[PDB]
Amino acid sequence: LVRLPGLIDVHVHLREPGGTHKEDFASGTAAALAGGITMVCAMPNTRPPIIDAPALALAQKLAEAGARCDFALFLGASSENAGTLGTVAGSAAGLKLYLNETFSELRLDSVVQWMEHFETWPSHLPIVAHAEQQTVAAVLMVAQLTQRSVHICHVARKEEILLIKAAKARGLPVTCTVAPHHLFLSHDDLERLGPGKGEVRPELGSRQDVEALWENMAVIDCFASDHAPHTLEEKCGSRPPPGFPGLETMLPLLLTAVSEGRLSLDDLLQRLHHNPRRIFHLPPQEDTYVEVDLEHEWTIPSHMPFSKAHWTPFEGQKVKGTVRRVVLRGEVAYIDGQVLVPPGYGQDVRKWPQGAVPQLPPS
């Protein structure tokens, strides 16, 4: 067995409030623990969406009562809320901008609206953007015009990682995350998945996109699942929403890659622990660790045990490595397929004294 620190997934969709047949805080954080994850950051594209103080207050209580691991909640940018989030901004994981079409009603239709958010959101707090292809260059321009940093979530294309690489070479403050489906799946998999299951944003890339991401691993700051649960009925239906569940498969896939020498254990810990902490200013978790077994070989089944999504695009993949035990803040939280902490054990890390983002005092 190997002992790892508590891993952090900075990009999950837990569907509560409003989509709880797909997942809720209790089921989604159970999936997190089973995947060796002890802290999650939940996206705001719920129903109602987390785009104002009252929606945030509601989500916070739902999470505090339902979460089994620790968490922070993102606020979402809308066409109406720029300049209105200053009072609650510090209590959120960060601000999420949806800049392309995806499972969300929050798309901003004008770059001027992006600028307004970059100008009004506190400068010391994280901004994350769903930005695909040329949109990555556009949001980078807005970040430069407003003189601040931006984080690009789920980078999926050779085009995108090479653009980010060029920006870092010029010293621009940009960081990025890559999700496991964009490292381990490609167009070649759509035959097997079909057009419904295969729907995700950004879409699965070519083999060349996948190869470019591996070749440019040094450019990738974080891994995150983009856990996006939808039921099989929805994925197989007439208007399939995009997204894959992934909390329970992420670490097993990456541990397999480690065992094959495609990256080191440190590469993994930088991207699932240290970089998430430092980019999102997330606090340490006392007495918290994950024990993995690197020798157990298994095949991913048609669905993982915990997520309500009840399906997985990785069905049939051979992996080596499994999560054996998770201890969270001194309590056994997970052992071999059984979660052992109840809904509500998890806490909002932004309310911990060490979880606040340091800022310069009033002028």
Q: Is 273 in the site for ligand NCD (CB under 6 A)?
A: no
Q: Is 221 in the site for ligand NCD (CB under 6 A)?
A: no
CB of 134 to its own copies, least distance (A): 4
Whichever of 229 and 252 has its CB closer to ligand NCD, that residue is: 229
Whichever of 103 and 352 has its CB closer to ligand NCD, that residue is: 103
Stretch that binds ligand NCD, among 50-58, 238-246, 269-277, 321-329 (CB under 6 A): 238-246
Whichever of 36 and 229 has its CB closer to ligand NCD, that residue is: 229
Whichever of 123 and 135 has its CB closer to its own copies, that residue is: 135
For residues 32 and 339, give the distance between their C-alpha atoms in angstroms, rounded to a whole number.
10
The mark string for 170-209 relative to ligand NCD (x by CB under 6 A, - otherwise) is ------------------------------xx--------
* Interface with Zn ion (CB under 5 A), residue from 226, 234, 248, 348: 226
Select the binding partner of residue 103 from Zn ion, its own copies, ligand NCD, none (C-beta < 5 to 8 A, by kind). ligand NCD
Q: Is 20 in the site for ligand NCD (CB under 6 A)?
A: no
Closest by CA position to 87, among listed 118, 121, 119, 61: 121
The mark string for 40-59 relative to ligand NCD (x by CB under 6 A, - otherwise) is -----x--------------
Q: Which residues in 51-70 contact Zn ion (CB under 5 A)?
A: none
Q: Is 135 in the site for ligand NCD (CB under 6 A)?
A: no
Whichever of 57 and 166 has its CB closer to its own copies, that residue is: 166
Tell me, rounded to whole angstroms, the distance of Cα 126 from its chain centroid: 14
What SS3 string covers the chain?
Answer: CEEEECEEEEEECCCCCCCCCCCCHHHHHHHHHHCCEEEEEECCCCCCCCCCHHHHHHHHHHHHHHCCCEEEECEECCCCCCCCCCCCHHHCCCEEEECCCCCCCCCCCCHHHHHHHHHHCCCCCCEEEECCCHHHHHHHHHHHHCCCCEEECCCCCHHHHHHHHHHHHCCCCEEEEECCHHHHCCHHHHHHHHHHHCCCCCCCCCHHHHHHHHHCHHHCCEECCCECCCCHHHHCCCCCCCCCCCHHHHHHHHHHHHHCCCCCHHHHHHHHHHHHHHHHCCCCCCCCEEEEEEEEEEECCCCCCCCCCCCCCCCCCEEEEEEEEEEECCEEEEECCEECCCCCCCCEHHHCHHHCCCCCCCC
CB of 130 to ligand NCD, least distance (A): 5
CB of 199 to ligand NCD, least distance (A): 7
Q: How many angstroms separate the Cα of 202 from the Cα of each of 77, 279, 284? A: 19, 22, 31
Q: Is 24 in the site for Zn ion (CB under 5 A)?
A: no
Which value, in Å, is the radius of gyration of the alpha carbons in the chain?
19
The mark string for 59-98 relative to ligand NCD (x by CB under 6 A, - otherwise) is ----------------------------------------
Closest by CA position to 266, among listed 216, 274, 165: 274
Whichever of 13 and 151 has its CB closer to ligand NCD, that residue is: 13
Residues binding its own copies (CB under 8 A): 99, 110-112, 115, 133-142, 144-145, 158-159, 162-163, 166-167, 170
Q: Is 103 in the site for ligand NCD (CB under 6 A)?
A: yes
For residues 271 and 279, give the distance between their C-alpha atoms in angstroms, rounded to a whole number.
11
Q: Is 130 in the site for Zn ion (CB under 5 A)?
A: yes
Stretch that binds Zn ion, among 1-9, 158-166, 220-228, 303-311 (CB under 5 A): 220-228
CB of 240 to ligand NCD, least distance (A): 10
Residues that bind ligand NCD (CB under 6 A): 13, 45, 102-103, 130, 200-201, 226, 228, 241-243
